Amino acid sequence: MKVPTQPIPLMMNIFRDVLPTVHRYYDQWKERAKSIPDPELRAQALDALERKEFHCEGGGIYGLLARDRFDELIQFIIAYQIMCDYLDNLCDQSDYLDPKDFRSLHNALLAALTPGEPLVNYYQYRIEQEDGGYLHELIETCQHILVTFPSFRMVQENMLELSQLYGDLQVHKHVVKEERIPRLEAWFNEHKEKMPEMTWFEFSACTGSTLGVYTLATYATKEGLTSEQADVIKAGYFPWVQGVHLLLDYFIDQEEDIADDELNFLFYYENEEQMIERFQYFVQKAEESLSTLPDPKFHRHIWRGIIAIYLSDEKVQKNKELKKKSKQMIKMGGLPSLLFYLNSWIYRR
Amino acid sequence: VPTQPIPLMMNIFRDVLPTVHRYYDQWKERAKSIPDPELRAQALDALERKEFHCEGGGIYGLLARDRFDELIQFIIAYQIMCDYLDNLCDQSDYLDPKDFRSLHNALLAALTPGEPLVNYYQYRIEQEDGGYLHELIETCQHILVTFPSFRMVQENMLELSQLYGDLQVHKHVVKEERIPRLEAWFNEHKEKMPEMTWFEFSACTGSTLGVYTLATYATKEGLTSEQADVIKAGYFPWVQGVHLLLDYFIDQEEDIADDELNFLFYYENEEQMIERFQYFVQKAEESLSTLPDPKFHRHIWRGIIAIYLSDEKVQKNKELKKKSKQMIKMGGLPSLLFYLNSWIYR
């Protein structure tokens, strides 16, 4: 009955059930994306699918908490995540940089979390519009599944709040370079009163994960969730757990971003020791919020799994300075290094 | 010496496997230069398919860090020889035991510094290897003679190598002559062994772990003859027997399909096979505990068992899966390894 929380059965279920199920649906979307009529939209859809499998693989692990709705929960997670990464590509690769385009696109995520929302032309503010129904199909996939979850209505408000903040982030960060930080700071000002003490760039990190959305959807599959329980679940992931994941994402990409002078949120810390100190703080708060969740051991394994996977990257492990700093940031009993050497072996064979 | 999962796996994947690959890759390059196209093909095939034997063998280096690279080089050279010779005998057009015996005398030469090298191919047409086999032999000879307790363990190493060789000769002759040879051969040694059958004895002789363990402890100063016999007895007969009985267990269906020699088929019934397997396991547990670094040796042995049981041939065969859980208590590791492999090799 209970979700596996020992490493052997947990890992076994991930490789037997989660990964093949994720890829069954992922591969179906790959085939649909090839049919996209507009060659630019088609290229951006396929590129996102080629490069961002891991996000769906990680998200699908939450299916183990809801075995009775395993396939449909994974279908939701995968559709929503595919959307996120497709829209990330569309905004990141736009030649035009209209925030109205970015906003319109990210309103698709709100529609996905709103059964009965009329589907509109999300591409109305850009030149490329013929996707053969790809984005609509992704939205509808989510809508059709979520409405059948017996506690969806109880988590829906919390899911939309997280989705809205994520959307805001993608609008502001992709505009012409000179307008990005001013937009992000003014946006943080709208929400600063209601958040714990943090900077605009820490807040930006907290909003950029989809883990909260998937966790809420997962507990939506169970009968009789209360409003207080839905708020506990949201708080378990937001802001601190989501923040750690995005701070790590930006940590790994520092060398690439400093080469191209791309927006990296970690650059706005006063110095490296402040960055490290605040990361440690974030880790402590995230540990704390995870402990408040149902199935606390499971959520801890997932969270620390994703951290070990990110830190196992060649960009950390082969960089003497980044490896040093990463071990000060979080202690993982040598797991990131072990995963790096294991992956090196698997590549060779 | 690390005896717990994460640092043991850390030491294996960081230190052992890349060191194994340095020298294994060097041997591939020599194999490509083999003039005879059939010898070349068989050597490359063995090198392509049997790298895991060297990877696993090289883990013993963790017991002798002061001679890490040297010990690993010996283990790799010897194992490469074994798998190359296995291919030559298995894929033979002419099932001549003189040829099979001649080839396996290279293993004896490898464990005998000063032994003059001959044409090990002299009973077959395929002979021009460009010195490949001699180079493997000399790698072993030149390393082993520099180990300070090699002379103390040499007799025991040769005994195991001889038995291994004997097995390969008798295994590969024309089908109808195999069992008589194995039975006659078992009768020569039957009095020195614990109570067992010819087919169990054959299993006991088919592993190289004893050789590598003895070479590992040959790196230590001042080993006695009594210590050398304890080390040999730690792996032979029981640990090697479990290893090879599992090997046969995995291949049962293919051997039925091909009408091939499988040593498990000569038990009186399934219950007896399982009862004796369980007895072998308990005796192997007992013998491993008499070694120094007993927890390390147990981990490697049980790792080998988990890997064997994770094979698709066990995990996707309901009867074999059923028996395997009765045969040994392994938890969920074999299933986990199966699904991990299934995901990668997808």
Contact A247, A266 (CB under 8 A): yes
**Is some CB atom of chain A closer than 8 A to the CB atom of B339?**
yes
Contacts of B335 in chain A (CB under 8 A): 12, 16
A positions 16-35 inside 8 Å of B (CB): 16, 19-20
- Nearest CB among B13, B336, B339 relative to A341 is that of B13
Distance from CA of B271 to the nearest CA of A (A): 30
Long-range Cβ contacts of B159-163 (<8 Å, 24+ apart): B159/B232, B160/B205, B160/B210, B160/B211, B160/B214, B160/B232, B160/B236, B161/B107, B161/B108, B161/B110, B161/B111, B161/B211, B162/B108, B163/B189, B163/B205
* Nearest-Cα residue of chain B relative to residue A13: B336
User: What are the helix (H) ranges across B91-129?
Assistant: 97-110
Query: In 3D, which of B301, B318, B321, B322 has the Cα closest to residue B309?
Result: B321
Which single residue is written with the structure tokens 């089908």? B175
Question: What residues contact A145, with CB distance under 8 A and at least 6 apart?
Answer: A72, A73, A75, A76
Sequence-distant (6+) residues with CB within 8 A of A223 are: A150, A151
**Do A15 and B336 count as a contact with CB atoms less than 8 A apart?**
yes
3-class DSSP state of A62: helix
Q: Quote the tokens at residue A193.
A: 């009163």
**Cβ contact, residue pair A15, B51, below 8 Å:** no
Q: Which long-range contacts (CB under 8 A, 24 or more apart) does A176-185 make?
A: A176/A97, A177/A263, A180/A263, A183/A99
For tokens 């490697």, what's the residue?
B300
Q: Which residue in chain B is spatially nearest to A332 when comparing CA positions?
A: B6
B314-321's contacts with Cβ under 8 Å and 24+ in sequence apart are B314/B249, B314/B250, B317/B253, B320/B249, B320/B250, B320/B252, B320/B253
Mutant choice from B333, B339, B345 vs A, greatest count of A C-beta within 10 A = B339
Nearest residue to B17 (alpha-carbon basis) of A309, A308, A348: A348
Which residues 116-145 in chain B show a CB within 8 A of chain A? none
* Residues A9, B332: C-beta atoms closer than 8 Å: yes
How many whole angstroms separate alpha carbon A98 and alpha carbon A88?
14
Spatial separation of the C-alpha atoms in residues A21 and A31, rounded to whole Å: 16
Please give, rounded to a whole number of angstroms, the shortest distance from the CA of A70 to a CA of chain B: 19
Largest CA distance in chain A: 54
Among candidate residues B53, B52, B72, B50, the one with its CA nearest the CA of residue B61: B72
Nearest to A129 by CA among A40, A43, A48: A40
- CA A3 to chain CA centroid, nearest Å: 22
Residue numbers followed by a gap, chain A, C–N over 2.5 Å: none
Q: State both tokens at A132.
A: 């053969």
3-class SS of residue B29: helix
Q: Residue B7's closest chain A neighbor by CA?
A: A334
Distances (CA, A) of B82 to A209, B17, B161: 53, 19, 10
Query: Token pair 């050597």 is at which residue?
Result: B43
Residue of B nearest to A21 (CA): B343
CA–CA distances in Å: residue B327 to residues B254, B270, B305, B311: 20, 11, 11, 15
Distance, in Å, from the CA atom of B154 to the CA atom of A272, rounded to the nearest integer, reads: 59
Interface check B222 vs A, CB under 8 A: no
Q: What is the DSSP letter of B293?
A: S
- Chain A interface includes B257 (CB < 8 A): no
A196 at the B interface (CB within 8 A)? Answer: no
Taking an 8 Å cut-off on Cβ atoms, the answer to whether A8 and B332 are in contact is yes
Q: In chain B, what residues touch A344 (CB-CB under 8 Å)?
A: 13
Compute φ and ψ for B111, nearest 5 degrees.
-95, 15
> Is residue B311 within 8 angstroms of chain A, CB to CB?
no
The number of beta carbons lying within 10 Å of the beta carbon of residue B199 is 20
Q: Which two tokens stand for residue A110?
A: 């709100």
Burial class (CB in 10 A: 0-12, 13-18, 19+), B53: middle
Contacts of A67 (CB under 8 A, 6+ apart): none
Q: Which residue has the tokens 């093949």?
A: A20
Q: Which of A145, A156, A135 is nearest to A85 (CA)?
A: A135
What percentage of chain A's residues is helix, strand, coil (to nearest 5)? Answer: 75, 0, 25
* CA separation, residue B340 to residues A13, A50, B25, B294, B315 (Å): 10, 22, 26, 29, 13
Q: Do B10 and A342 touch (CB under 8 A)?
A: no
Q: Which method was used?
A: X-ray
Rounded CA-CA distance A116/A135 in Å is 16
Residue B193 to residues A183, B187, B267: CA-CA distances in angstroms? 83, 10, 19
Q: Does A150 contact B at CB distance below 8 Å? A: no
**Separation in Å, CA of B332 to nearest CA in chain A:** 7
What DSSP letter does each residue of A232-301 carry, written as one string? HHHHHHTTHHHHHHHHHHHHHTHHHHHHHT---GGGGSSSHHHHHHHHHHHHHHHHHHHHTSSSHHHHHH
CB contact under 8 A, A344 and B9: no
Cross-chain residue pair A12–B332, CB shorter than 8 Å: yes
A16 near B339, Cβ under 8 Å?
Answer: yes
Q: What is the DSSP letter of B58?
A: G
